[PDB]
Write a protein that binds this DNA or RNA. Structure first.
Length: 183
DNA sequence: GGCGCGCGCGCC
DNA sequence: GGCGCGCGCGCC
């Protein structure tokens, strides 16, 4: 059903494969929840700006993440719209590596984590991330082999998937994964 | 090329 | 939710 939200975050459009297309990620908030959104129509980028209020209908979902394909289904909302501020806070919280270690393979993961160790191999790059509860490997290939970063930088992860790899839960990149290196 | 407008977002 | 530095990018 149609849902009206306020945009909290939205990345710049980026290239990806399976067919090779374009997309960006966004995070939005109703008055009762926050959601991650994959937008596959890059002509909607102007509707997904910080603080813009939009109404989303005729979309699809997948593991709690919204998918938007046709611009025909986003409309501006210019009446008054206020979301409770904890929804904003939750929407911006990065989960703990100790909780990530307790979810099922398949779970999609988004957050900001600091990069403690970078190991580059032939086709894969293992980015070790840490917080005050644990460490975890991020596996990046293709677009995310050997990206520019060093110890102390932080990584913003968008739509990474928890997978068991050599008997341990890791984050691995797929077609829609995005990683941004900060500072 | 490369100015300069004005956002993004980590930090506050 | 505000701030402002760093930057992305339309324009010439």
């Amino acid at each position: 059903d149609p849902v009206t939200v306020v945009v909290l975050k939205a990345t710049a459009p980026f290239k990806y494969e399976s067919g090779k297309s374009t997309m960006f990620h966004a995070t939005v908030a109703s008055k009762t929840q926050y959601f991650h959104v994959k937008v596959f129509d890059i002509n909607l980028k102007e509707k997904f700006v910080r603080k813009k209020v939009i109404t989303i209908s005729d979309y699809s979902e997948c593991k709690g993440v919204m998918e938007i394909k046709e611009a025909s289904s986003v409309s501006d909302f210019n009446q008054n719209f206020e979301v409770p501020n904890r929804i904003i806070e939750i929407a911006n919280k990065t989960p703990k590596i100790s909780q990530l270690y307790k979810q099922a393979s398949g779970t999609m993961v988004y957050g900001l984590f600091m990069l403690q160790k970078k190991s580059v191999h032939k086709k894969n790059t293992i980015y070790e991330i840490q917080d005050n509860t644990g460490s975890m490997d991020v596996v990046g290939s293709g677009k995310w082999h050997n990206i520019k970063c060093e110890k102390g930088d932080k990584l913003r992860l968008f739509c990474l998937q928890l997978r068991t790899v050599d008997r341990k839960l890791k984050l691995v990149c797929g077609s829609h994964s995005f990683i941004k290196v900060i500072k």
